[PDB]
Amino acid sequence: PLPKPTLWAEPGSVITQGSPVTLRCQGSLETQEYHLYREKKTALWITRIPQELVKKGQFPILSITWEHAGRYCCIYGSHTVGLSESSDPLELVVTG
């Protein structure tokens, strides 16, 4: 039951439409085993983030749309030493 990671948004969780935002998750080790997800509805855009970013715990959105809004959580963890708990939810809001 590893510690839950820290998930945040840059510049923030409320970003106007068409503008960029990057979701970020940092847990323990340097890199390499992060996973982001949206909970009531799968966020397909996550499955397209290159491994190089995902390994750094980075999930960019260059041009945010309405369908991006939702509740996001993430967990890290290596086969061993094991998977972590879900971070607290991030409310990703889109406006304008």
UniProtKB/Swiss-Prot annotation:
Disulfide bonds join C25-C74. Detected in B-cells, and at lower levels in natural killer (NK) cells. Detected in peripheral blood monocytes and lung. It is found in: Secreted. It comes from the Eukaryota. N-glycosylation is required for ligand binding. Residues 3-84 form the Ig-like C2-type domain. Acts as a soluble receptor for class I MHC antigens. Binds both classical and non-classical HLA class I molecules but with reduced affinities compared to LILRB1 or LILRB2. Binds with high affinity to the surface of monocytes, leading to abolish LPS-induced TNF-alpha production by monocytes. This is Leukocyte immunoglobulin-like receptor subfamily A member 3. It comes from Homo sapiens (Human).
